[PDB]
């Protein structure tokens, strides 16, 4: 189990760690989060009590270094940093644990939610979507735009998701216009899976990362990406059977975890009704269709 210590908490803030969250008061004696499960990526995220504008946070993998949080009063945010002195770090964490100044990552033993939401998400791929190579961890916030959003303005601060566009020469083979537009299997299997992503695990990883950025930061561009990757599969007549089964599990856990009160902005009616009721795969997402119908029957 790993630890992300905090130097201090000078401003009142709601802190999230994965799907958990807690409130820290201004100058409360808070020194971080312990017992973080090893083997998964994680996200630690923040919403200031005084400015609900800008949710922001950091994707990280404790196997890649010793990371801590320190508020910066000039830039006005909690910043993740790497501590290179391993003996300094262990000594800091041990003192904070002995004084019991840390919250415990509060995983229930039965609970596979976080694994199920991040199964295919890798830190190395996150770092290619979020480019800042001098750090091992990746900052995301509510306002960051995607490369595709920029095409339609600071590139350093962009989300470089794979561009998907159903009315594009990449998506449509000359002479197969109608075929490729109504059945996107070519674009899914040859262009995207074989060509760009290499395998379905990398595809699912980006799909999962996009959902999580939409959910945790209300990042609109990420929501667009999540829906596009779903729609590309559902609009393909020819999808490997193992991918459909896995997609159903992926989406089931995303819909299960979504805040009930955010469904109106985070779920696109057109995509979901098309995917569950009109698309080639309308009959292939049994778990997802059941949870959607029982939890958001209004959207449909």
């Amino acid at each position: 189990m790993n630890t992300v210590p905090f130097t201090s908490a000078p401003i009142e803030v709601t802190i999230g760690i994965d799907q958990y969250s807690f409130n820290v008061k201004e100058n409360q004696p808070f020194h971080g989060i312990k017992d973080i499960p090893i083997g998964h990526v994680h996200v630690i995220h923040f919403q200031h009590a005084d400015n609900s504008s800008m949710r922001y946070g950091y994707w990280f993998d404790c196997r890649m270094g010793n990371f801590y949080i320190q508020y910066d009063p000039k830039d006005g945010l909690y910043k993740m940093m790497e501590e290179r002195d391993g003996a300094k770090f262990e000594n800091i964490v041990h003192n904070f644990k002995e004084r019991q100044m840390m919250v415990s990552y509060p995983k229930i033993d039965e609970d596979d939610t976080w694994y199920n939401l991040t199964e295919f998400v890798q830190m190395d791929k996150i770092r290619k979507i979020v480019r800042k190579d001098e750090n091992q961890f990746s900052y995301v916030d509510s306002s960051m735009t995607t490369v595709q959003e920029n095409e339609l303005s600071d590139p350093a601060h962009s989300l470089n998701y794979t561009v998907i566009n159903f009315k594009s020469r990449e998506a449509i083979r000359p002479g197969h216009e109608m075929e490729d537009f109504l059945d996107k299997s070519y674009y899914l299997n040859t262009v995207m899976l074989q060509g760009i992503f290499k395998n379905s695990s990398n595809y699912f990883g980006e799909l999962q990362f996009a959902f999580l950025n939409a959910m945790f930061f209300g990042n609109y561009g990420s929501s667009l990406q999540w829906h596009a990757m779903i729609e590309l599969i559902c609009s393909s007549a020819t999808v490997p059977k193992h991918m459909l089964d896995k997609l159903d599990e992926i989406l089931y856990y995303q819909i299960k975890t979504l805040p009930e009160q955010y469904s109106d902005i985070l779920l696109n009616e057109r995509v979901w009704n098309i995917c569950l009721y009109s698309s080639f795969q309308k009959n292939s997402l049994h778990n997802t269709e059941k949870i959607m119908e029982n939890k958001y029957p209004e959207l449909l």
Partner: protein, 237 residues
């Protein structure tokens, strides 16, 4: 954006544009089978592609053989239309290609956009106008060439005959749509109006009769009457 009452004069500026109407592309007769079921039999159709400034009508005849062995024909017809319009544009010199293509039915937007991806600078636009181009097959010479075709064929007509020697393209288009609206609302009456006087003939390269300016005003008046009437006869007013 969409073409409507407010931006109507844009049709007659000097930016090349084409209207595309797909109504008459896939045409059928519905009939009973010996077993008493219902079947369709396709008949020849046409794409109606019109330059509203010049009257240039590129009439692509759709022969029934293009439907053989195909499913979902109403959907295929929109993609066939887009394929042929794309082929037409590519066949024109660069300086003759349109800067905009206006489709008369919104369901043509995605088919045409996808076929024209090679032409990102050609705007594909819908319209809110309820244009009467479906009545093109009520023009005898156009109907005749479509029904006689034995293979795919493109036939060229000026839909304005020689009118542009005497009137502007705004006026010519208004006359065209009045004639076609009338033919759509009551074909028999419209055709009676146009031919009642045997001394006025249709030139061999023309589609409509050789009315003088004064006779066109009368003709145009009679077409308005017809349309207002049928609107009463229809709604009882």
């Amino acid at each position: 954006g969409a073409m409507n009452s407010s931006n109507y004069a844009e049709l007659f500026n000097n930016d090349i544009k084409l209207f595309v109407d797909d109504t008459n592309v896939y045409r059928v007769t519905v009939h009973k089978t010996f077993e008493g079921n219902v079947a369709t039999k396709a008949i020849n159709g046409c794409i109606f592609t019109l330059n509203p400034k010049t009257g240039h009508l590129f009439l692509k005849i759709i022969h029934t053989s293009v439907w053989a062995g195909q499913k979902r024909l109403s959907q295929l017809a929109k993609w066939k239309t887009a394929e042929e319009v794309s082929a037409l544009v590519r066949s024109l010199p660069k300086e003759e290609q349109p800067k905009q293509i206006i489709v008369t039915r919104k369901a043509m937007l995605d088919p045409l956009e996808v076929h024209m991806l090679d032409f990102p600078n050609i705007a594909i636009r819908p319209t809110e106008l309820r244009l009467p181009f479906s009545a093109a097959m009520s023009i005898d010479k156009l109907s005749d060439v479509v029904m006689k075709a034995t293979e795919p064929q493109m036939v060229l007509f000026n839909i304005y005959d020689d009118w542009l020697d005497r009137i502007s393209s705004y006026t010519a288009f208004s006359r065209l749509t009045l004639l076609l609206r009338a033919l759509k609302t009551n074909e028999e009456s419209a055709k009676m109006i146009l031919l009642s006087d045997p001394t006025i003939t249709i030139k061999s390269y023309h589609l409509w009769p050789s009315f003088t300016d004064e006779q066109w005003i009368t003709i145009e008046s009679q077409m308005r009457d017809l349309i207002l009437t049928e609107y009463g006869r229809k709604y009882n007013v």
